[PDB]
C-alpha cells in the first residue's frame, strides 16, 4: 500500500499474509476457521503456501500469529490466465488445521450478492496489506491500510486501454499518490457498515501503482459470493 498508514494490532483481524518462495507475496481474508479468500493470480495448484493470520509486523513476533499450511487451492472455475491473468481473479485456500478465532483472528463478513453490491456502491472502502509502500520499492513491515473511493466505470474505461470487465471495479484517486501495490493482491477491499466490515472486493491489478490518472482494479466480490459460500461451507 502506497501512501497509506500503519494499522494498529487487531484493526483488520480478517487480514492474512501469504508466504511462499518469497514472503508476503500476496494477502488474503479469513472466510472462516478453515478458509481463506485471495486472488487467483497469487496461487497455482500444486504450489505450497503458508498462511499467517493475526499478523502485524512480518519481521517481529507478536504472539498473536497463527500459521497454517494450505491443503487445497481452488481458483474460480472461470479463471484462465491464458485468456487474461486477471478476469475472475479470485481463489479459495483450505487450511490444514482450523484457525482459533479471537481478537486478532476474525472472519470478514460476506453478504449476499445484492447487499455486497449495495455496500460497494456506498463508495468508500478500505484496502490493506504488506505490499510495497512505493512503486518498485520495499514491502511494508507493519500492516498498511488505505481508504479508497469508488471510481465510476466510464472514467475507468477511459483511463486505460486494457479491458475492465463487469467482474471488476475501479478505486483510487485521480491525482495519484495513494493506492494498493505489488504484494497487496489477494488482500481485501472492505466496506464498514455500522461497525461491521463486509468484503466488497479483492485487490487485483493496475498499471504500476499510485500514478496520476490511473486506478487500482479490483475483483467485484458480489459476483462470486454464491461460489464462496458454497465452497467454504463447514456446515
Amino acid at each position: 500500500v502506497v501512501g497509506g498508514e500503519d494499522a494498529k494490532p487487531g484493526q483488520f483481524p480478517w487480514q492474512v499474509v501469504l508466504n511462499g518462495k518469497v514472503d508476503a507475496f500476496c494477502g488474503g481474508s479469513i472466510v472462516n476457521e478453515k478458509w481463506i479468500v485471495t486472488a487467483a493470480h497469487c496461487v497455482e495448484t500444486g504450489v505450497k503456501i503458508t498462511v499467517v493470520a493475526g499478523e502485524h509486523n512480518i519481521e517481529e513476533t507478536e504472539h498473536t500469529e497463527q500459521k497454517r499450511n494450505v491443503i487445497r487451492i481452488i481458483p474460480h472455475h472461470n479463471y484462465n490466465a491464458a485468456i487474461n491473468k486477471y478476469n475472475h481473479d479470485i481463489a479459495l485456500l483450505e487450511l490444514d488445521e482450523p484457525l482459533v478465532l479471537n481478537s486478532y483472528v476474525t472472519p470478514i463478513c460476506i453478504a449476499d450478492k445484492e447487499y455486497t453490491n449495495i455496500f460497494l456502491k456506498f463508495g468508500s472502502g478500505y484496502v490493506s496489506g504488506w505490499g510495497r509502500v512505493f512503486h518498485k520499492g520495499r514491502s511494508a513491515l507493519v500492516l498498511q491500510y488505505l481508504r479508497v473511493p469508488l471510481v465510476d466505470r466510464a472514467t475507468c474505461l477511459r483511463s486505460t486501454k486494457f479491458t475492465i470487465y463487469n467482474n471488476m471495479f475501479c478505486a483510487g484517486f485521480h491525482e495519484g499518490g495513494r493506492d494498493s501495490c505489488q504484494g497487496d493482491a489477494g488482500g481485501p477491499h472492505v466496506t464498514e457498515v455500522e461497525g461491521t466490515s463486509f468484503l466488497t472486493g479483492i485487490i487485483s491489478w493496475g498499471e504500476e501503482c499510485a500514478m496520476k490518472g490511473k486506478y487500482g482494479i479490483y475483483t467485484k466480490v458480489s459476483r462470486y459470493v454464491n461460489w464462496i459460500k458454497e465452497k467454504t461451507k463447514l456446515t
Binding site: 487487531g10 480478517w14 476474525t106 472472519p107 470478514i108 447487499y115 464498514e192 455500522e194 461491521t196 466490515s197
Partner: protein, 54 residues
C-alpha cells in the same frame, strides 16, 4: 410510501426484505442475531465476523 427497504433500509442495521402491507423483515449475517428492536444486529458468538474487538 412509509416503510419499505427502499427508505433508510427499512431501518434495518444490516439486511432488509419487504413484507406485505407497509412492513419489512430485518435480518443479520452469520454470527449475529436480530436485537430486541427487530432492527439492530448483535453478536451471537464470541468473535462475530467483521468486527474489531481489541
Amino acid at each position: 410510501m412509509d416503510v419499505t427497504c427502499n427508505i433508510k433500509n427499512g431501518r434495518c442495521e444490516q439486511f432488509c426484505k419487504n413484507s406485505a402491507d407497509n412492513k419489512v423483515v430485518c435480518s443479520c449475517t452469520e454470527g449475529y442475531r436480530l436485537a430486541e428492536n427487530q432492527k439492530s444486529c448483535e453478536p451471537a458468538v464470541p468473535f462475530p465476523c467483521g468486527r474489531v474487538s481489541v
